[PDB]
């Protein structure tokens, strides 16, 4: 595969000829004092030609072309070669270097075609992308015969300056083994010490260290504060190997350290997959649909006059990420992460032209409300969208921010059990919000300024409705166009056109600085404005309880040694990352989707019991499926104010000994929330207007959101101990079309007086504890009640209880063991200066009585304990 890239002079000649036709239209076919033919573009032996023109030739005169046997040819026929006269050479990198293969200069990327109606791709194609920052310049020679007239050369030189794109990119044409070895040490340590259940967790946590090597020095210790962590001190230890790797001078560079953690995590990831010995599923399968366009070779040749009026409108601005975004690009080598983002070779984030055009084309069809059914090949489609898109140019954009992507872990819940489904865990790289991309759109055409469709589209983007990336259903890819400035250039005027040619259209960075001074602030106002497809709903959630959005990988890495930590995300501020706590969009979407699915049925079957593959139930119509994109988009919910996580610790009590059982530590670090200082969770989800105009769709969402508002769908984890309990949910921005559905006092009987009789004598001394002997029969059922629906004949609701102390109560605050000044001292448990009893304390207390009354099992019991007495 060794060699080098090059550009054919035939491809350059093709673009020059296309530019000459546009210039001859503006000059009405005149170059200086000579007039030009339409040219000849018809050959009888059409088989010899690799490609035939499918577009229509531009028309500037009605006269017949030059004769085949003519003494003189017009300047446009001289350019075509109907007179080598003008020979084009290949364009090569200067110096003729060599590279190992195509992957030494660039990377293949899949470019898909998305079906407009379904929102899903059904075919794709691939191409190598070679970064301009590494290989910017190709050099070549155009050979011109001396018998070529001056008017022809003037047309040629003006056409080179007019030619603005080639090979898919805007252009200016001028004429004049540590990870390998560390993986084995870690794997051997894991295998020697019989700790292989942690191979995947260690791989994910080590990969998260690529952010900075200073994370190694802060790796958590055990609850005692000593280097005895269950993961980093398994062995030397894993921590010492990581600490040695961090201190290595080779890994001192942040770029070298980042590659090391990625290679190490990938090596440990392969080993973890090899361990399992059951059924193995390929998740990404049946995905190859590589279809290439096929040009039509029996296409009718046409000559079309477009008129002498040509105006180019330049729009420069900024595309600012208001949410995390995901431009999907999966590397074949990397398998640890299921979903990856598109980055530049120097690890900068990228906003590609292919995605920008795809969003423009989709939005133009949305404005016209007219799908395009054109196929790849043939003459260009003549609908309003395709004709506008042929006048549109967008420049590929990259950021300054270059920090590693944050990886979000998504699961699928088994709806019958209420737990994670077997093997349903996958990763996704996520680009951060707050990134700024330099935006430049140019439109070329005969209208006065922009078309009304493009004025409305660019106004949509300026209002923050530029949804430009994948993963839209989980709130990825919303941009706003900011600092928009425009100026229309009149290419029909000869003075303006000569000035436009002289500066190569002001498209290079130097020329663009001059042009940005000429631009006027704002956007052209659309004469006929149409409302955007998506409408924003603002959601307010009040939480009088602690909240946690489980992030297991951050728990393993955070300097806090806690077992469970809350999800946090990073915002880009220039080239810095600012962490904030958030409720994940994926988690919130899953809860909302479950609330709809558990109360709706299709043909008597709950929607949770459906496979929802090749399905068109109510749930698939609103939330999408594997065949049709969803019509509702959930964003991350952030917290008003800045609550700081607090730590809670728990112990399981052996039902026989009555003391703390020997179990793995499961302390949690949730965000505090209380009735006095409730958590305020705010964000927005967007819903398509056709969904918002449908009475049955708004009815389905209103019923589900009524159950969330009534505290039936807690947010986050640890719901059993009192976390994530929603006090109220409100929505605004729907004209009450959904919120309209989101809206006796009998005394509780007194307890019976007990019949338990205990006789106590003052002279006796009694033991502090006694044992209740269980019945020998334990009633067990093989299948418990499923969670997939509200079953008929069952009961769902709330119990409100009052607890009163009869003797002094000690529920300690164990965060501070030296409260009253070794001799440990504790204060009573409180949250936000409010005296409380956590639900886990009350849960375990009542569970023990329930086990004894129902004669259940010993739920907490140290079975593997081995007793030992002493000989007498």
């Amino acid at each position: 595969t060794k060699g080098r890239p090059y550009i054919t002079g035939t491809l350059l000649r093709s673009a020059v000829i296309r530019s000459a036709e546009n210039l001859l239209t503006l000059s009405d076919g005149k170059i200086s004092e000579k007039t030009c033919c339409p040219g000849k573009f018809d050959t009888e032996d059409k088989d010899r030609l690799l490609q035939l023109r499918q577009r229509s030739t531009l028309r500037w005169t009605d006269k017949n072309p030059c004769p085949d046997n003519a003494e003189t040819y017009c300047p446009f026929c001289e350019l075509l070669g109907r007179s080598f006269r003008i020979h084009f050479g290949n364009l090569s990198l200067p110096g003729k270097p060599d590279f190992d293969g195509p992957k030494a200069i660039g990377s293949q990327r899949v470019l898909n075609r998305v079906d407009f109606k379904s929102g899903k791709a059904h075919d794709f194609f691939k191409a190598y992308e070679v970064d301009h920052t590494r290989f910017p310049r190709f050099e070549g020679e155009i050979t011109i015969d001396n018998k070529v007239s001056a008017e022809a050369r003037k047309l040629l030189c003006d056409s080179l300056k007019f030619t603005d794109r080639l090979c898919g990119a805007l252009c200016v044409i001028r004429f004049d083994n540590l990870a390998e070895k560390t993986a084995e040490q870690i794997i051997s340590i894991l295998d020697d010490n019989k700790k292989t259940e942690y191979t995947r967790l260690l791989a994910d946590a080590i990969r998260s260290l690529r952010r900075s090597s200073k994370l190694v020095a802060g790796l958590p210790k055990d609850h005692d504060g000593k280097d005895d962590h269950y993961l980093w001190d398994i062995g030397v230890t894993i921590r010492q190997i990581l600490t040695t790797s961090a201190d290595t001078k080779e890994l001192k560079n942040a770029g070298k350290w980042r590659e090391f953690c990625e290679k190490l995590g990938e090596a440990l990831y392969l080993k973890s997959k090899d361990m399992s010995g059951g059924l193995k599923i390929t998740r990404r399968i049946l995905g190859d649909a590589e279809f290439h366009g096929k040009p039509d070779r029996l296409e009718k040749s046409r000559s079309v006059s477009i008129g002498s009026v040509l105006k180019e409108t330049v729009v420069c601005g900024e595309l600012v990420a208001k949410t995390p975004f995901f431009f999907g690009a999966i590397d074949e080598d990397a398998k640890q992460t299921a979903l990856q983002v598109l980055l530049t070779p120097d690890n900068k984030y990228r906003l590609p032209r292919s995605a920008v055009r795809g969003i423009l084309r989709r939005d133009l069809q949305t404005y016209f409300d007219s799908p395009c059914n054109a196929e790849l090949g043939g003459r260009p489609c003549m609908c309003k969208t395709c004709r506008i898109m042929r006048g549109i140019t967008v420049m590929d954009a990259r950021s300054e921010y270059n920090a590693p992507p944050e990886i979000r872990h998504r699961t699928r819940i088994n709806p019958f059990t209420g737990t994670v489904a077997e093997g349903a865990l996958f990763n996704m790289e996520v680009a951060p919000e707050g990134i700024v991309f330099p935006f430049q759109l140019r439109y070329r055409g005969s209208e006065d300024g922009l078309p009304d469709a493009l004025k409305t589209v660019l106004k949509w983007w300026a209002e923050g409705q530029a949804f430009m990336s994948g993963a839209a259903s989980t709130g990825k890819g919303r941009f706003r166009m900011e600092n928009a400035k425009y100026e229309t250039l009149d290419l029909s005027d000869e003075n303006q056109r000569n000035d436009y040619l002289k500066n190569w259209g002001w498209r290079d960075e130097k020329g663009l600085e001059e042009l940005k001074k000429r631009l006027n602030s704002g956007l052209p106002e659309p004469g006929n404005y149409r409302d955007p497809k998506w409408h924003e709903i603002n959601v307010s959630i009040e939480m009088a309880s602690p909240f946690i959005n489980g992030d297991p990988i951050r728990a393993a890495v955070d300097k806090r040694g806690t077992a469970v930590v809350t999800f946090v995300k990073y915002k880009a501020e220039g080239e810095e990352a600012k962490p904030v706590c958030a409720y994940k969009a994926e988690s919130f979407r899953g809860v909302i989707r479950s609330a709809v699915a558990r109360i709706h049925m299709e043909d008597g079957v709950p929607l949770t019991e459906l496979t929802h593959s090749d399905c068109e139930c109510l749930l698939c119509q609103i939330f999408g499926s594997e065949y049709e994109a969803g019509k509702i988009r959930f964003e991350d919910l952030v917290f008003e104010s800045d609550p700081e996580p607090v730590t809670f610790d728990h112990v399981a009590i052996d039902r026989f000994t009555g003391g703390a059982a020997a179990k793995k530590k499961f302390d949690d670090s949730p965000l505090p929330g209380s009735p006095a200082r409730p958590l305020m969770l705010k964000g927005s989800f967007w819903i398509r207007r056709d969904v918002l105009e449908d009475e049955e769709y708004c009815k389905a969402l209103g019923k589900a959101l009524a159950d969330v508002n009534n505290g039936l769908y807690p947010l986050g984890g640890k719901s059993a101990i009192g976390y994530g309990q929603v006090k109220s949910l409100g929505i605004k921005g729907d004209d009450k079309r959904i919120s309209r559905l989101m809206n006796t006092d009998v005394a509780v009987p007194e307890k019976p007086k007990t019949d338990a009789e205990v006789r106590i004598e003052a002279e006796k001394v009694y033991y502090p504890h006694y044992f209740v002997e269980p019945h020998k029969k334990v009633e067990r059922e093989e299948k418990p009640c499923g969670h997939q629906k509200f079953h008929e004949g069952r009961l769902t609701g709330k119990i409100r209880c009052k607890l009163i102390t009869k003797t002094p109560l000690i529920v300690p605050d164990t965060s501070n063991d030296d409260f009253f000044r070794y001799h440990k001292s504790y204060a009573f448990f409180r949250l936000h200066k409010q005296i409380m009893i956590p639900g886990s304390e009350l849960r375990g207390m009542v569970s023990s009585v329930y086990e004894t009354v129902t004669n259940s099992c010993f739920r907490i019991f140290d079975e593997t304990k081995r007793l030992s007495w002493r000989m007498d």
Binding site: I281, R302, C372, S613
Partner: protein
């Protein structure tokens, strides 16, 4: 319970035995698979009894340790599911589970046979979503080939692997792809294997015969029992076998029997096989494809559905157009050639995806009768994609309007464009001219013309017209002169008698041509100077009725660009601006004259969703067709710019699109006046005023066109001709 199954396997399991170890592995494999799916079996929370013994047996099994046999039985469960949705889902699970084993070097052939067969069956179930063949279907058939080639490299004559390789190769041909490289070699080996008495395999041996001319397999084919479910396939196979044996009488007998029992759905592979039979008989110069093609067309033409009066819907079969071209070329009677051509006209052809869109529209408007009929079509086509492979066969007519009903003084000119004949270098365009006043042996004439240059002239005007309307006037005059050069018989008195009115029934892109404005060369003669023209979308819409005796005129205007002076101020009611409610009310009162001046929007993909741009709302074509209590018998309707706005740009020369004029003819409207291209507002005011005043559209339009022709004659300017040419009359009143 999967757990109870494992426990039973553990009670009686001999590890040296292979029957027990296969059952135990099956119970283990089944339990793991039900866990990955979040099925209701995951609610089983119990464990295995006799833990010390269960642990030892399970530990020995893991040290002793087929994947192929368990998954083979899972595939045999797929072939028995009735619905294609059930089969498509289960094929999804089999493919993803067996992908791991295929990567392994030591991969069992049973594992590879099951996975290749699952890819082939999933490839048959890919539903199209466009004009192109699904790219996934091609990939699925290529993956099945790759897996079989792994087996075939080890054993070049594996019986089942060859069949799966040949099944996928045939479907690649059906998808427009060429045959793979070794198709000739793989086909020879299956012949060496022997003969298989299965319909899905007989076609493979016929392909062998056509390439090797070996007669040993032909007599075996002719002896097959005729008690099978897919009898039409066997009759076609025997007709193919009889043709190689020169038993031409039996080719006719079996070929006719196959067509008489043909499957209802066009997705059935029989239809492409039937067309290939005709193309081969025609290629071998056998004068027997003509009977087959005519009979095939005669049954193919009843595969349509009715969407209200005069509006017919059909589903897309890619080779239906070729079959009609074959039947047209086979038929010799000119009158019967007109019946073939007229069977295509005024019919909307929708893909399976667009039929879902129309199914949803019918559901919204509570049109359950039309929704149920669309459901059967959708299911029947989707359920026939793997019917040949599964060996299943799941279980209307319209009258002909006689040609003598045309009044004696008139002349009818039917058109048909033959794409197949034009590709072969012939004159694909045919004018079928009918003269009621001639002798019955001379009443019909068939004029053949080449439409290649005419179609190119139309596309140049259409592109110049879309980019710069009214600046395309010169290209229009060049186009109108191209009509006469293509069809010079229109200006010959022998072909068309002078002074007699001419009825036009165009086909394809000829519906969008100004046939009445054909120009013959320094003086210039326009067609309307000699004849008065009418237009019909098809001959089967010919239902003359007396005009409406009620005298009342309406002007539904939603056109703010221009104010029509001569039309708005007068005896005509002006309900401007116009909303869908206003339009519906005016339709129900049966006006003598109705004017609808507005804009419209075109839907390229689905003509039933093209809409009239009205005040605060849009009215789709399907909205117009579904209005209840509509009386428009003998009502003369004049349309503004909406008619040209709601027709997409042309893409194929034989494509026809439904517009407002078809929507109004469905309501038995007498006459409809509309322009082919966008009509100048001032000329619309002048032209429509004269028609309403004099109430004789056929005569008045010819007079008005000639009165404006005199102005054009003095200057010969294309700009004036651009404004008078577009107007034409649609419909044939009594």
């Amino acid at each position: 319970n999967p757990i109870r199954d494992i426990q039973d396997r553990l009670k009686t399991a001999k590890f040296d035995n292979k029957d027990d170890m296969m059952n135990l592995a099956s119970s283990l494999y089944k339990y793991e698979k039900q866990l990955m799916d979040s099925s209701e079996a995951t609610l089983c929370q119990q464990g295995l009894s006799n833990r010390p013994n269960s642990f030892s047996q399970l530990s020995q099994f893991r040290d002793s340790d087929q994947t192929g046999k368990f998954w083979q039985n899972e595939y045999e469960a797929c072939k028995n599911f009735q619905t294609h949705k059930e089969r498509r889902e289960t094929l999804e699970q089999i493919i993803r589970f067996l992908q791991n084993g295929a990567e392994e070097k030591d991969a069992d052939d049973l594992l590879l046979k099951t996975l290749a067969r699952a890819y082939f069956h999933r490839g048959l179930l890919y539903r199209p979503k466009g004009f192109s063949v699904p790219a996934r279907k091609v990939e699925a058939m290529k993956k099945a080939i790759a897996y079989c080639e792994i087996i075939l490299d080890k054993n070049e004559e594996e019986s089942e692997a060859l069949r799966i390789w040949l099944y996928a190769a045939m479907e690649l041909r059906r998808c427009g792809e060429e045959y793979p490289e070794n198709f000739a070699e793989k086909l020879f080996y299956l012949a060496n294997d022997g003969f298989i008495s299965e319909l899905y395999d007989i076609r493979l041996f016929l392909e062998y015969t056509e390439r090797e001319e070996d007669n040993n397999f032909l007599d075996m084919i002719l002896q097959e029992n005729q008690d099978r479910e897919r009898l039409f396939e066997l009759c076609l196979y025997k007709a193919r076998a009889c043709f190689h044996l020169n038993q031409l009488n039996d080719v006719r007998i079996y070929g006719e029997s196959a067509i008489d029992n043909a499957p209802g759905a066009f997705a059935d592979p029989f239809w492409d096989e039937l067309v290939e039979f005709i193309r081969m008989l025609r290629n071998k110069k056998s004068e027997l494809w003509k009977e087959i093609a005519i009979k095939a067309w005669d049954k193919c033409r009843e595969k349509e559905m009715k969407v209200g009066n005069n509006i017919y819907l059909s589903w897309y079969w890619a080779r239906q157009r070729e079959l009609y071209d074959l039947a047209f070329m086979a038929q010799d009677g000119i009158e019967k050639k007109t019946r073939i051509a007229d069977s295509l006209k005024s019919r909307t052809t929708l893909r399976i995806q667009e039929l879902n869109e129309l199914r949803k529209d019918a559901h919204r408007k509570q049109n359950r009768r039309l929704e149920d009929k669309l459901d059967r079509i959708i299911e029947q086509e989707n359920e026939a994609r793997d019917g040949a492979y599964l060996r299943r066969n799941p279980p209307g007519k319209r009258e002909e309007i006689p040609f003598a009903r045309l009044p004696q003084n008139w002349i009818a000119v039917h058109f048909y464009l033959n794409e197949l004949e034009s590709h072969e270098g012939g004159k694909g365009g045919h004018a079928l001219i009918y003269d009621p006043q001639k002798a019955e042996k001379d009443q019909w004439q068939d004029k053949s013309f080449d439409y290649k240059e005419l179609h190119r002239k139309f596309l140049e005007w259409q592109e110049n017209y879309i980019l710069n309307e009214e600046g395309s006037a010169d290209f229009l005059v060049t186009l109108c002169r191209e009509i006469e050069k293509a069809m010079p018989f229109l200006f010959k008195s022998e072909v068309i008698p002078e002074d007699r009115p001419v009825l036009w029934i165009p086909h394809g892109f000829l519906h969008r041509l100004p046939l009445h404005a054909a120009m013959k060369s320094s003086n210039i003669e326009i067609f309307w100077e000699r004849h008065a023209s009418r237009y019909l979308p098809a001959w089967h819409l010919f239902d003359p009725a007396p005009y409406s005796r009620e005298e009342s005129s309406t002007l539904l205007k939603n056109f703010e660009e221009y104010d029509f002076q001569n039309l708005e101020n007068g005896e005509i009611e002006v309900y401007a601006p116009s909303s869908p409610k206003k339009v519906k009310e005016a339709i129900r009162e049966n006006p003598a004259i109705l004017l609808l001046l507005c804009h419209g929007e075109a839907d390229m993909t689905n003509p039933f969703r093209s809409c009239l741009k009205l005040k605060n709302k849009d009215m789709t074509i399907f909205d117009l067709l579904t209005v209840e209590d509509v009386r428009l018998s003998g009502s003369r309707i004049l349309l503004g710019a909406c008619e040209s706005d709601m027709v997409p740009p042309l893409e194929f020369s034989v494509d026809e699109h439904l517009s407002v004029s078809g929507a109004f003819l469905s309501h038995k409207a007498g006459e409809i006046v509309a322009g082919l291209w966008t009509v100048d507002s001032e000329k619309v005011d002048e032209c429509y005023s004269y028609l309403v005043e004099e109430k004789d559209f056929l005569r008045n339009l010819q007079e008005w066109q000639m009165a404006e022709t005199e102005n054009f004659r003095s200057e010969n300017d294309s700009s004036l001709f651009y404004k008078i040419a577009p107007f034409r009359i649609i419909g044939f009143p009594a």
